[PDB]
Amino acid sequence: YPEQYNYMCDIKKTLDVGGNSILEMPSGTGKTVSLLSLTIAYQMHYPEHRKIIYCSRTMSEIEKALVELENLMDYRTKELGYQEDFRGLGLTSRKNLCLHPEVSKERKGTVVDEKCRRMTNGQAKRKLEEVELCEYHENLYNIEVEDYLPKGVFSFEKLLKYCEEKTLCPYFIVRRMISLCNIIIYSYHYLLDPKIAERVSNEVSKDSIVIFDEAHNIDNVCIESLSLDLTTDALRRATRGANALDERISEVRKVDSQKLQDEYEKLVQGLXXXXXXXXXXXXXXXXXXXXXXXXXXXXXXXXXRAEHFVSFLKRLIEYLKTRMKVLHVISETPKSFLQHLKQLTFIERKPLRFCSERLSLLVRTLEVTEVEDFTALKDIATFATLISTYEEGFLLIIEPYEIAVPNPIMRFTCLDASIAIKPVFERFSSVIITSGTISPLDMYPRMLNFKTVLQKSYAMTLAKKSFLPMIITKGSDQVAISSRFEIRNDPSIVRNYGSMLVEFAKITPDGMVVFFPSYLYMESIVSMWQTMGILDEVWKHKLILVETPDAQETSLALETYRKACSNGRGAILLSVARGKVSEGIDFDHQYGRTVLMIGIPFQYTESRILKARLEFMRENYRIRENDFLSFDAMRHAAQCLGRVLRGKDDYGVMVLADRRFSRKRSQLPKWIAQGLSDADLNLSTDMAISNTKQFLRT
Amino acid sequence: IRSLILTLDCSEAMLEKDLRPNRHAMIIQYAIDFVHEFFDQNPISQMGIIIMRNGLAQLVSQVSGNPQDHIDALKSIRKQEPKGNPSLQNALEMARGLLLPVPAHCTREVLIVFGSLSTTDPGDIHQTIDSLVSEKIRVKVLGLSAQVAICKELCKATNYGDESFYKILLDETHLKELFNEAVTPXXXXXXXXXXXXXXXXXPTRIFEDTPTFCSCHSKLVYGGYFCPNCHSKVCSLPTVCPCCDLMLILXXXXXXXXXXXXXXKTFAEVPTTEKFRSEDCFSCQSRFPXXXXXXXXXXXXXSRYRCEDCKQEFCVDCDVFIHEILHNCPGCESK
């Protein structure tokens, strides 16, 4: 198609010249473009030069990229008849890419890597001075396994079944195949991870093309890289962890103190560099991204052992308990907090080097490690590494006392996001940035400063198949104003709005998905609604996303949606744009043909974080009180707009309330503003015009 | 030859005010007219009317070739209010129960007038779709306004995987057009199998009524058909003799056969400035200029219709008339 062909030419010229490009792709028709453009762009140079580094935000997009990559393999193998070196490595979740926890553990928690470290330590201990090896090991590093992938694609599911048949473990296959430089499909939380980005950065060996897919929550991921809430219980886990460290000190000092002195000599002689250069296949700890930290010559507590580290650690956690037991409102400057700490007790600005080393020493002296104590020690260790370094833009904040019991909390505020993304513009080039929910695309040259080119979407045809109306008059124009407050006002008006949702849902009974700015309105209309005929006549049942989302509940709600729409029933999907699961799988009538939006998206205000980042961005780009109520809400609404668009062969309609939507842009800017009662008949005609123009335009 | 099962939606959704005065009355009336036209262009065909009311499928007109039974059965529906909800699965299962005794050499058609946007079925309708496709049953759905995915999968699955039979109606005229489309047969590409039937009687007409006679009802008559096999004098219809099971056809089978054999050759439009012949029609007589929108640019041009199988001239009204009825072109009878 010519429209996507233009984006192919843009990707070509930006990959051949520019080092980074902001490309705006139309929603639903821009996923399969870059996947083939990158491969052909690799074949025109020479077959193995740059590799695809596709980055998504969810796992569903990773699976879609895997099956579409398989469509690329079949596409290139069915048109030429020649077999080439296949690519495609599926890097997914650790719990989903492991087989043993499904045989004995029967758990899908985040502690599967700890059990994997127990098995790996079992292998190392059966190869040194002596649990079993695991299920199958010692044959995952051979050439045959290194060639099972280039000869045949085994990614994720095919790798899970292939490992279940060939009696292998997929974790070491993927880990050993990161250096093979295949098409890696991982998420943003792995490229910028203060524990994963280092090893991945050391295995990919750079020199590739990075593809930022749906790059609209990049600031959200850079924010989520820090901010850890200290909620008084971590102080108890740190106290019990310090007691466990004292017991371990009594154990290593009781009988076996030679290994601690030998490793201590390894620290005095070769320091952290030798300690990390000698150990292989050993569990590591957290770090504030060593490539971004750039701090060498880590001295081990001014050349000291473990008793001094646990003494200064007890003093440090006691100082933390002292700083967390205060009045109520108090803000901290990370420099003033470090100076106050120095006034309480001298410890200098080197507890970072004192944590990254002592944690590894304790690991080298521990054989039975408790998970909660070690986890709390890793939390306090991260807090130390981030009060010792990284201060520009960092802002320690104490949560106020609001009952005062449920209160002693201390959160650290992260720094400028440009710093975190920075290394990719030295490691790499021609980083393609594609997103279908960006409008306007000027807040990415502004916020996050980087020199790039701007390419907007140039595809807009068959406007009769993309019904895009907006509702302004709700029959009284009183719910659009009351539906914009943080706390709802006049419950009777909200009940009238819900009645309007009952009338609208009754008018168009063909799959409805409703998005809310928060769960307060949902919990207010679901308690006592004075009506339920929509569930009793057209919808049979209603689908509600819990304010505390669950994986199995959401999965049963989505499968219930597909089966309900495949039985000719339909169901209303009351979800939150700010909640979990942003979806993205459409291209069928099983999804909501009509989508309802309750006003415009809103972010929770009256929070210390929004004021800290508010004044920070105010000092940075001077975009105060203007972009945090239109850019974020524009992205959250665009997440709902992207679900309506699903190819030109399909149709749909999305109703946006509130006049304030005119102040923001939108994908395909062709919108007509009228009432809701008129939109009922208008949609009643569109449900037939969309069915008439299909065979006429074909 | 054909066996159509008319399944009308008769639920609460039909009580709405779309058609005038409501959807139910217009669907019933247009269904009566569809019975008239269907039994006019298909004499030896079979019909069976089922309604979807109260969440159940109710057979209101048994499979028969007499139109009066269907007429009365349709008159009884308009005297009650359509209540309940439609059930596509029960209607398709009962339609299966009515189409199974039909021989394989006769087509099995199910015409569903679906006005509601939702159905109430007990079991999984996809299994019923598999059963319909397995036993070869063509299903055509005339839906109201918005589309239903189940109707798409049903009409597409029951027609060799081709989708062009789930017709959307937007007005009374459109519904009339679809009704008319169900009169005409559908010579599809098929799957290439064997076909033939044997034993078709031709009757002798008995005018005697002094003592009267009846072998199918034992009542008084004014004359009746004669079976050339069991030699019974029954009520007159060109359908099957109910005394030994064989047809009683006459010139009606020839009529519908020739109607299914009509090529309907559209005559080519040639301007008078290109044909160089005087304004003439061979079925009547036309000295009328067809084109005259402008001055001399259109008046002196006109339009003469041409049958190329005889090189003859005709006017438009006669092309339309010979396309409606009669064999095409009188000039093709003179050599």
Ligand code: SF4
């Ligand atoms: S070797 Fe594989 S199966 Fe065994 S614990 Fe490690 S990841 Fe799990």
Ligand SMILES: [Zn+2]
């Ligand atoms: Zn007989």
Ligand SMILES: [Zn+2]
């Ligand atoms: Zn004429």
Ligand SMILES: [Zn+2]
């Ligand atoms: Zn002729």
